Structure formats: structure tokens, C-alpha cells
Amino acid sequence: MVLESTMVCVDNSEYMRNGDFLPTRLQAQQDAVNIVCHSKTRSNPENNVGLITLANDCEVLTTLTPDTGRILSKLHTVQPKGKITFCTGIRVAHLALKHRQGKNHKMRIIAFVGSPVEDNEKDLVKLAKRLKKEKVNVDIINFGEEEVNTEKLTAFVNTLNGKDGTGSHLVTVPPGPSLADALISSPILAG
């Protein structure tokens, strides 16, 4: 509904060769990207989207664009290779989305955590403060190999949306054969 630019951040770690979701996690995250980006597209054609990989070299596959076809096309040969480097991935996401043409568009980060993530406890909590001062709304989805919202990630997201902000969600997927339906139940349309 809101006028926004969204950076989807899909995992391409070797851990993506897990298989808890429907037949292949590798294919499954593509349908997840499809359903999340379609929501941002149908809300308003001016709302725009880019994409990023968080694992290995955090390369910007797509710059912010209203052409969703570029995002769905670039999801090919995403080639799960490395491991989630979230520490730099989340910040490069915002650094990339802030180069947006239409500055009135809202901040929005959606990222796929499909691998175990290691980070400094003392600082990950204040990266939330960083993105707060940068006014960035961040929704993070966690996968089965994440042991259901590690305390660090829960604290980080809670302080990022603390004091009853937008309530940007940290959605853990129900482990096993389940898609990103937990987002489209309500959080993607409310939060």
C-alpha cells in the first residue's frame, strides 16, 4: 500500500542445498521471491524492487527498478556456493537501496536467512540502532537451518523496531514442508 522501494536479499549459500522446504529449497526461495515481489508490485506500479545475495561476495544482482521481470529473471543460476555473511549483507542492502531515484519511497529490507549466521553480540544489537537512524524498515525471514530465531537475531529485530515502531517482523518459517505462507498470512500486508 505504501510508496516504497524494497531490496530482496536471497541466500545463495551452500547451505541452500538443504531440502526441508518443498522439493528443493533452491527452487522454493524463487517462489518466495515471486510472492513477496508481486505484493510490492500490485500495491503500486511506482513501488520498486532490487535484489541482493547475502552469501559469499554480496553482489547486487539487480539495482532498484519497477521492472519485476528483471528480478525474476536474475534469480536463475543463483548457484548456492558460500555462506551467509549477514554482517556486511544487511548494511550493503541499505547502502544500495539509498541510491534510489525517488527519495520519497520508504525504506524496506527483506532478506532470506537460510544458513547459520555468526556475528558479534556487542554490535549486532546496535546495527539495529544504525538502521533506525537510517530509518530502514527491515523484515527478516529465517529458514529451517536457523534454529528458530537465535537470541541474537530476535534481540536485533526487537530493538530495530523497538518502542512500538512499524513492528517489522522477524518471521521464522515453520520447519519442514512450508513456504513463505507465514508472511502472506498477515505480516507482509500488516507490518
Partner 1 sequence: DIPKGYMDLMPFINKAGCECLNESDEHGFDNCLRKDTTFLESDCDEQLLITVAFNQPVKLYSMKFQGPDNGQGPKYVKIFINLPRSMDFEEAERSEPTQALELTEDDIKEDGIVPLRYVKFQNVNSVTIFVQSNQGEEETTRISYFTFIGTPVQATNMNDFKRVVGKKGESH
Partner 2 sequence: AVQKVVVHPLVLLSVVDHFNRIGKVGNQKRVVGVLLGSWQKKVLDVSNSFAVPFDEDDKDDSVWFLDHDYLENMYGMFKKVNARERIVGWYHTGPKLHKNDIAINELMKRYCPNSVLVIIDVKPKDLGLPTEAYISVEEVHDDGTPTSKTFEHVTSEIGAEEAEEVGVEHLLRDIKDTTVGTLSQRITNQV
Partner 3 sequence: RLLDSEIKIMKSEVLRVTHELQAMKDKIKENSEKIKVNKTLPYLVSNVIELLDVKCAVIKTSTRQTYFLPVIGLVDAEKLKP
List residues near partner 1 by CB under 8 A. Answer: 98-100, 102-104, 129, 132-135, 165
Q: Are 86 and 119 in contact (CB under 8 A)?
A: yes
62's contact among partner 2, partner 1, partner 3, none, with CB below 5 to 8 A by partner kind, is partner 2
Q: Does 63 bind partner 2 (CB under 8 A)?
A: yes
> Which partner from the list partner 2, partner 1, partner 3, none does 190 bind, CB cut-off 5 to 8 Å by kind?
none
Residue 173 backbone phi and psi in degrees, to 5: -70, 145
What's the closest the beta carbon of residue 184 comes to partner 1, in angstroms?
A: 25
83: nearest Cα among 120, 105, 50, 58 = 58
Residue 27 contact among partner 2, partner 3, partner 1, none, beta carbon within 5 to 8 Å by kind: partner 3
Q: At closest approach, how far in Å is the CB of 61 from partner 2?
A: 8
The CA–CA distances, whole Å, from 101 to 4, 46, 83, 106, 171 equal 11, 11, 31, 12, 30
Distance CA 70, CA 76 (A): 11
Taking the C-alpha atoms of residue 94 and residue 43, their distance in angstroms, rounded to an integer, is 22
> Which region among 24-32, 49-57, 154-162, 165-173 touches partner 3 (by CB under 8 A)?
24-32
